[PDB]
């Protein structure tokens with residue numbers, strides 16, 4: 001199923017996710033719906049909280065043939081180093097982009113879709129994508145890093161878009 005993705009300024013985007021107790025068929029259903037939603041909207045990363053599910057689940061696929069599915073359940077950052085930034089986007093903040101400071105290289109531990117643990121060292125776009133997604137789970141958005149003026153302007157832009165989006 002394709003789930004509805006929440007937009008700012010929804011308060012549900014600020015909720016802190018609870019860890020997944022046990023990776024069972026219900027959780028795997030959520031993971032599959034999340035991938036389906038992400039591809040449908042053509043994103044490359046999705047956090048559970050963006051679809052108003054407040055558990056520590058993230059799906060990522062940066063691939064062209066939509067066939068390098070990455071699932072992070074209960075992710076934990078073990079190490080990070082360096083500093084980078086690209087102009088990030090987000091399906092919850094339609095059509096807005098901004099450069100945000102991130103660590104360059106990241107090492108995480110997580111469970112996969114089967115509930116098996118794994119470690120992953122990432123750099124480049126993957127490292128940035130994992131940080132951006134891990135932020136969602138503690139109620140952080142990429143605009144939180146920007147100046148008050150920049151944040152206000154982004155909110156308006158999105159409110160204007162959702163206002164036209166429904167043409168009645």
Ligand SMILES: [Fe+3]
Nearest residue numbers: 089090091092
């Ligand atoms: Fe996002």
